[PDB]
Amino acid sequence: METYKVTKTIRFKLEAQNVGLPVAKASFNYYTINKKPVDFGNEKSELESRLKISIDTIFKLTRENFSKKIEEAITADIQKELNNGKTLLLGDVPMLGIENYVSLRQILKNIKSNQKKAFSDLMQSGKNYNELKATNLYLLNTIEQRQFDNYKVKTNELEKLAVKINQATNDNQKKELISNKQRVAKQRGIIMRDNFATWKSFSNFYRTISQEHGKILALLKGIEKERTESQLLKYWALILENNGQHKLILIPREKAASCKQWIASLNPSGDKLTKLFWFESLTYRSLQKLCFGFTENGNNKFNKNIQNLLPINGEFAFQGDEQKKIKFYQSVLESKYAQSVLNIPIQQVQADIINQSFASLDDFQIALEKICYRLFAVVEANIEAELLKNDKAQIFNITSSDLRKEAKDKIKSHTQIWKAFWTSENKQNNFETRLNPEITITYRQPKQSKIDKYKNNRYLHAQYTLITTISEHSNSPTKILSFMSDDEFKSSVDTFNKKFKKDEIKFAFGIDNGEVELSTLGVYFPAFDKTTYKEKVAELEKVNDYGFEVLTIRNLNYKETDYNGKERKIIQNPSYFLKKENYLRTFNKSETAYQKMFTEQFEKKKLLTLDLTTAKVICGHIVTNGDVPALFNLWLKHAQRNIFEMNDHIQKETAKKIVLKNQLDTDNEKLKFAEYISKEKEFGKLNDDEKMKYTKWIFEDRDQNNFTEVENKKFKRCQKIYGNYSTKAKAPVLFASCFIDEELQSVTDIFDVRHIFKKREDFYALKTEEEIKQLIDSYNTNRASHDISNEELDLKILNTKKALVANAVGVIDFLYKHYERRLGGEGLIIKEGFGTGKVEDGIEKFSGNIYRILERKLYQKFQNYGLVPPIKSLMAVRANGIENNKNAILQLGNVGFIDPAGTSQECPVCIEGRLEHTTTCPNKCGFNSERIMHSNDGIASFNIAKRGFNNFVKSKTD
RNA sequence: AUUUCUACUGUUGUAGAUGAGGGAUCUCGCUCCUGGAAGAUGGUGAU
RNA sequence: AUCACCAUCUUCCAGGAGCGAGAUCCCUCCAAAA
RNA sequence: GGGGCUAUAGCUCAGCUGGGAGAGCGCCUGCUUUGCACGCAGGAGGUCUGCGGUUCGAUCCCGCAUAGCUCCACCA
Ligand SMILES: [Mg+2]
Ligand SMILES: [Mg+2]
Incomplete structure (x- = not known):
């Protein structure tokens, strides 16, 4: 759809040939080298x-x-x-x-x-x-005196425990401290906080x-x-192209004046295998800064002249009208004086701007910006030495890995724009891709932690990096947000949503969150809506025409030996087994062998739904098992943190002890965990003898017992952290306990118990079960929690969540393209929008919940296509999400939101059937999810998409 | 082995993602400095 | 055995600054002619 | 534990409209039969669930706390 200007910060590497903290900064445009601070005078008032x-x-x-x-x-x-x-x-x-x-x-x-x-x-x-x-x-x-005394009961006990002076046996002193800090000092604080x-x-x-x-x-x-940042520009910059490679030339302002006066005299002959370059441009924003900037002081020279054109003085004089501004500015360029100091193509701007008429102020900005951006060229021979000698010009070389390799076609996107900027097919579009005129340079030191231990590397030696900014769709409307009122944003989103139409939308997705399956995907179309049950069932059955194609690895343990005698496994990096060029080169197999392998290891099929827990895009194919390792790093960081934040991190010795087990031993632990998993109010009412039966319910196999249904009605109501903790579970859990005494003796006092890790079958392909050694490593008490050292494990919960999202955005964007080029229209992303109270609970029951990140990384992706607006303050518009309304819908562009009430327990064909039905609708209709959906859990995403599409079209009707 | 991240990783590197800099408020974990209160213990002086 | 003082020293509270983790948020990134 | 409803005298309850605190039962006392007592009479009983705000005036509108049932949204 129609787009709007978008910016990005792309960077490369610079190699120095003649000469983190910002060592230098520079601007290509020769007229921004002496900038002055913005006029913020209006806002301050x-x-x-x-x-x-x-x-x-x-x-x-x-x-x-x-x-x-x-x-x-x-x-x-x-x-x-x-x-x-x-x-x-x-x-x-x-x-x-x-x-x-x-x-x-x-x-x-x-x-x-x-x-x-x-x-x-x-x-x-x-x-x-x-x-x-x-x-x-x-x-x-x-x-209340109930609270006042309760506070004093702790106080006297606390001060009574301040007699640790009398102790001369550290073995006994360390036991004293834990009874003080945890049980008393940390409890008194809570009493005053929440009561x-x-x-x-x-x-x-x-x-x-x-x-x-x-x-x-x-x-x-x-x-x-801002008044301090504008000082730091120092250099005019040039780009000297040679043999298909660019060089970066700087030159200080002490010489930039003479250099241009010299360079402009050189011959624009044409193409001679070497060019020098320099940019020129003017823009709408800079024009207002020239006419109405710092006018009150009276020192604005553009107001010493040009006064005849003024309406009275100041920008407000135009009463907010659009067209009156247009005519005034045209007169500014139409005046002689402005044409005597500015540097613009008078004849073309005269022919194309001054005499024309514009229907809105937006087009005037584009036409002005469109025509004033130029890329000159002087191609005289041997133009390198004069700059080095006369102009004392520092020089670098712009290089990057992709810019050095031999093979082409496959290249990174941020390198796909730089090489696409210089092409001739772009210069004829008036530079749709634009290189803005300010740049900067950084210099990073090598990591000492890498020099000492040492393998080619980047951190092993310093680096010069160039940080630039590039705009795409430069000839579309511009949208900025600085200093908007938090109530104008909600108005901005409302206007932007008028672009979409009832008939433009052809399909819609649907995403469902969870903890056993972090995200599930589906797709819905209007064609699935036949009138009769027989037709509805038949139409969905045609998976061949609607679904999408996915690969599945067949034997995760399969490995091979390679051309160097090394061994490689499939699960670590499949892309060495799918790309034909790679398999032949590495394992030295022949054409017949490669086809034999592919036919044997990788199954394929077409389905409506998918599991985003481990899907990834490899060499053009969706592999449902191509991302196992990046999920292991998420069930590890969650475990490595829980067993580090449940210790005590005082600077002083303490006797707290913590140990791992696959099961629980005594009735103190089993009763302490069952309290950790149940509702405090409901659990408390449970009888002291009934409490032990409730423990047999959680921790034994129900098949070998006779818990009466009346007792089930209680065990099913006391539980709030759901799961399966038996010894025969599909993914057996791993436990950790905390106490002070040396040996349990079935009498010792225990402070906490917590489940840490889940033993998934697939993880055994990577690590053996004896690798809890690496989970344990990350717990300690000698480590005071204010130092960064070998134990740098805490840092990576956030960064490890973006790895999974990095693999779920490729799939979602890859499928979106696939269908748009088959149905010929745009579509909606849909996901339940349960506010913020439900989100915090989600992160509480698992540190790795991906809901909020998976959203904020969809806005970043689809803006490039112009489908969603720029987002200033998300929580202003979409906190306290929908609830108890089976018709409403919230919309930010094409990313809708709906009520998740009742989604996962209804048959797609019927309205009465329920799930957990063994793939056949219990109402006896013809629906059968056997080989339509990846799993019975996919019905939720399908239903979420189904409901989302209908609500959107319904809203547009009136 | 990368402008940067994640999984691999050296006969041309491979597969996915990628807007950066600086700063504000709050919650949890910890350290150092200054002041206040309660209190063990040696000693000293009055009683 | 009461009251006063010096000293080692234990705990808790207030304020200042700093380090690690999480959540919300903001601005900058195109101007000048003598 | 992530959204909704009621709560009036010791008990059960009418009243909830902004210009109005009450009924039955229970209790005490007096009357009284021979005797239970059918019965007559009066009295005690209130922070209008507790707290707080709005209003010329609030049990009545607005905001918090406790007691009872509802939702496969998170899952043997
Ligand atoms: Mg859901
Ligand atoms: Mg689900």
Whole structure:
């Protein structure tokens, strides 16, 4: 669909021949070398108009409600500071030249601190309940004597444990500490955090006020820095092309003036196997900066002239109309003076801009930008030495791996644009792909952790990197977001969604999240909607015409020996077994052998649904098992973190002990885990004898017992972290326990128990079961958690989640293209949008839940096609997602969202049938998911897509 | 073995993804500095 | 046996700064002619 | 534990409309038969679930806490 301008930051490597921290910066355009800071003068007035507060409206900045008694006290406390003509602000800003101001954020901090300080001295010195109630601690008063004493029970016990001086046996001292830090100090804090009603409220009133100030502080902070960033440009830059390779030439501004005066005299003869280059351009934004920039000071020379064309002065004079601006600017270029200082193709701009008429201000910007961007050429011989000698020009060479290899065709996308920029087919489109005129250079040191241990490498020696920015679709409308109001974004999305049409959409996907199968995919079409049950069943059955083709590895253990005597396994890297060129080269097999292997190892078939847990794109084929290793790194990092964050990381010795087991031994552990898996309220009501039967339910095989159904109704209601923990489970679980005593003895006290890891069958292809050695390695207590060292394992939970998404975006984008070039139309991505409360729960039951990342990486992908708008603040528009509405739909471009209510338990053909039916609809209709769907779990994604498509078309009807 | 990441990895490297820099608020884990309170123990002086 | 003082030293609380992990958020990336 | 409903005197409950705190049962007392007592009479009983806000005026509108049932969304 019609696109809009898009930017990206692509980089390469520079090789130095003549001469992280930003060692240098430069701009291609010769006129930006002496930039001046932007005119932010308008915004500063607005934010200054938002800092100031008037007391009386304070309590309207938060949802928290305070009674009148506290209401009067807090205002009274603040007023005591406003004497002597002070004025009130929402926060302290070290800018804007303000004086005699009182920071509301600071004052709220002070009263909270003093009260918490006073209440600590009171409780420790032994005063009584009725003595507290008469004091001025209006925040901590009114707590029940149930809480007041409960706090003091810990306090005396804590101070009573401060007699560790008397101990002269470290073996016994280390046992003392754990009984102090964990059981007492960490428990007293929670009591005050979640049970003091008035205290909790003020813990939220202060936070929101701290966040509101934070919002308008960073906004102002970025305004200050810009005035420092514009100073650092130093060099005009050139690109000298030679034998198909580019060189990078710098030149300081002490010489840039003379060099251009010399270079412009050289012959633009044509093509002679060597060229020098230099860019020229003007743009709409730069024109306003020239006419109305810094006008109030009166030093804007473009306002010393040109005044005749003015409407009165200032941009606002045009009353916001579009066409009046157009005519004024045309007159600016139509005036003689402007044509005497500017450098533009007068005859073409005269013929194409000044005399024309535009229907909107957008087209005027494009026409101006379109025509003023030029790429000159001077091709005189032996133009290298003069720059080095006369112009003291530093020189580099632009190089990268793809730019050095021999074979072509396969090349990385960020190298696909650079080589596509210089082509002649692009120069005839007025540079649809554009190289913007500011660049920068960095220099990274080698990693000392790599030099010491050492294999060709990058980190083993320093590197010069070039960071550039390139715009695609340069001749489409531009869209920017800086300083929009958080309520204008919701309006921007609403307008952008008018592009799509009821008839344009031809299909839709559907994605379902989970924990046994991290993501499942399906597809739906309007053709599946026949009227009768017989036709509906028959139409879906034609999988050959609708579905997609997928490979499946047959024997994950299959390996081979290669041309160097080394051994290679299929599961580590299939792409050495699918690409014909690779198999022949490496294993030295013949053409007949390669076809024999392919026919034997890789099954194939066509299906409607798929599993995104392990699918990847290899040499043009979808391999459902091509990504096993990258899932192992996710069930490892989750395990390596849980057994590191359940230790105690004091700087001082402690006796906490933690050990791994495949099963649980005593009734203390089994009862402690069953409490960890159940609802606290519902579990507590369970009888003390019934609790042990409930343990037999979880940890033994139900087949060899007689749990009565009435008892099942309880065991099925007390459970909230679902799973299967028996010894005969499909993916047996691995356990970890914590205690202080040396040996269990079936009597020892135990503090926690937690499931860590899941033993998936496929993982045995990579690592043997004896590789819990590598899971265990990442737990310790001697490591204080404020050091980065050999134990650098924590860092990679985020980075390891983007690996799985990197493999689920290729598949989703590969299928999207496939169908668009077969049905001839765009389509919708659909996924349940269950708000943010359901998302946090999801991450709670598994650190590796991929929901929020898998969304934020779909917006990044489909913007390039112009299908979704630019996204400023996602949570502003789509928090508290749909719920309890089987018709609504939320839409950001083509990425819709729907209610997941009842999806996974309905037959695609019927409305009454349920799942868990053994692939045949229990209502006795003809549906059979035997060889339509990858698995019975695929019905959810199919239903999610099915519902999504109908809701969207329904909305467009009216 | 890579502009960068992930899995591999040296007879031309292979397969997927890739907008970077700097900064703000909050939650959890930890360290150093300054101040306040409760308290063991040696010693000293009055009683 | 009461009260005062020096000293080793134990715990808890407040404020300042710094390191590791997670969540939300913001700006910059095209201007000048003597 | 991620969305919804009710809660009036000791018990059961009418009343919930912004201009209005009540009924039956239970209890105490007096009356009283020979005797249970059919019966007569009066009294005690309220933080309108607890807390808080809005309003000229609130059991009535608005926001939190506890007690009861509902959803394969997360899964032997
Ligand atoms: Mg779902
Ligand atoms: Mg599912």
